[PDB]
Amino acid sequence: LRGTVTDFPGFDERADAETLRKAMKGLGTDEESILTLLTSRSNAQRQEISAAFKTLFGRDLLDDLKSELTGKFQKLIVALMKPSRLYDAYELKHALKGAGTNEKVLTEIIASRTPEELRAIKQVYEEEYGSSLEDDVVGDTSGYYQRMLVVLLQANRDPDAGIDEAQVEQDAQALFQAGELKWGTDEEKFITIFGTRSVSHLRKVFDKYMTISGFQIEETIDRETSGNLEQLLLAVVKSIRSIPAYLAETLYYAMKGAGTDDHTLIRVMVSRSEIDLFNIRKEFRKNFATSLYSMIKGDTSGDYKKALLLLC
Numbered sequence: 001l002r003g004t005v006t007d008f009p010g011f012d013e014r015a016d017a018e019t020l021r022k023a024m025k026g027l028g029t030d031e032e033s034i035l036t037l038l039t040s041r042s043n044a045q046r047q048e049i050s051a052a053f054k055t056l057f058g059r060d061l062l063d064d065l066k067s068e069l070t071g072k073f074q075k076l077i078v079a080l081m082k083p084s085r086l087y088d089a090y091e092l093k094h095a096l097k098g099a100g101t102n103e104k105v106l107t108e109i110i111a112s113r114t115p116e117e118l119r120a121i122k123q124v125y126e127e128e129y130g131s132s133l134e135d136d137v138v139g140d141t142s143g144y145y146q147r148m149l150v151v152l153l154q155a156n157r158d159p160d161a162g163i164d165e166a167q168v169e170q171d172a173q174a175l176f177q178a179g180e181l182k183w184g185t186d187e188e189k190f191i192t193i194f195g196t197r198s199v200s201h202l203r204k205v206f207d208k209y210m211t212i213s214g215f216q217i218e219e220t221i222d223r224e225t226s227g228n229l230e231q232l233l234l235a236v237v238k239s240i241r242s243i244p245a246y247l248a249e250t251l252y253y254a255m256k257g258a259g260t261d262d263h264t265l266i267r268v269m270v271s272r273s274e275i276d277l278f279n280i281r282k283e284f285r286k287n288f289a290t291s292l293y294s295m296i297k298g299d300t301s302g303d304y305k306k307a308l309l310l311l312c
């Protein structure tokens with residue numbers, strides 16, 4: 001896992017505070033200055049620039065960036081400024097909050113994050129927002145989608161140790177028979193297989209599944225659309241195989257067709273900039289025969305594409 005953003009060598013929080021102050025101060029705004037500085041500092045350095053900005057000027061850097069900037073560019077800079085430890089929990093709170101629910105952010109983050117990451121997300125969510133992530137998810141979702149989400153939210157998959165092939169055989173069968181009935185009959189049985197087994201066990205299951213049916217499990221669950229639970233099952237199957245591959249694909253489908261899902265583009269670009277965006281880049285090129293760069297550049301404009309291309 002290699003990230004695309006790294007600590008800037010020779011950082012001076014005070015110098016960077018003053019540069020940012022100068023870019024904003026007075027009539028107008030110098031976005032080029034802001035943009036090139038904040039995509040080359042790490043998230044933790046940005047936090048030190050904010051601290052230093054308030055000691056020197058008594059102003060809040062994020063409110064100033066929200067006042068001075070506009071549109072998708074403002075959305076991206078505000079996302080970059082969010083402390084890394086708060087961001088997935090923030091995005092989770094905003095998919096739940098209000099009327100309806102953005103199931104896409106819920107599935108994405110709960111299926112692509114590791115048990116370590118989730119233990120930490122549930123802790124910072126509680127701290128920050130006062131309610132349990134579990135109680136807000138249950139407050140907002142229904143049926144087996146809710147159940148599988150809660151199962152994944154316990155952050156208790158089995159450990160990667162004994163490949164119990166008897167259990168590999170049995171679970172492969174169970175999934176096969178669940179596959180043919182289009183993931184609509186024994187939901188309890190497969191929610192436990194998909195949510196509770198080790199990543200190594202399930203990889204061996206997905207293989208034996210293929211030898212039993214001739215094809216890949218995502219083919220049967222595939223309706224890359226329609227039905228919350230199917231969409232989650234597909235996000236889990238793809239993340240068991242490769243989280244950088246699954247994230248590269250949501251990125252791809254954020255730009256394919258008319259429009260752009262700029263919210264997903266900003267969310268995956270920002271949240272993974274210092275975790276695995278390099279690996280996601282590799283996966284993108286290899287699976288889609290285009291680089292992430294080229295697609296971003298075709299699908300985005302202005303200061304917002306300059307900043308994205310610098311984070312890519």
Ligand SMILES: [Ca+2]
Nearest residue numbers: 024025026028
């Ligand atoms: Ca100004």
Ligand SMILES: [Ca+2]
Nearest residue numbers: 028029030031
């Ligand atoms: Ca300007």
Ligand SMILES: [Ca+2]
Nearest residue numbers: 066067068069
């Ligand atoms: Ca503004």
Ligand SMILES: [Ca+2]
Nearest residue numbers: 096097098100
């Ligand atoms: Ca809601």
Ligand SMILES: [Ca+2]
Nearest residue numbers: 255256257259
């Ligand atoms: Ca498009």
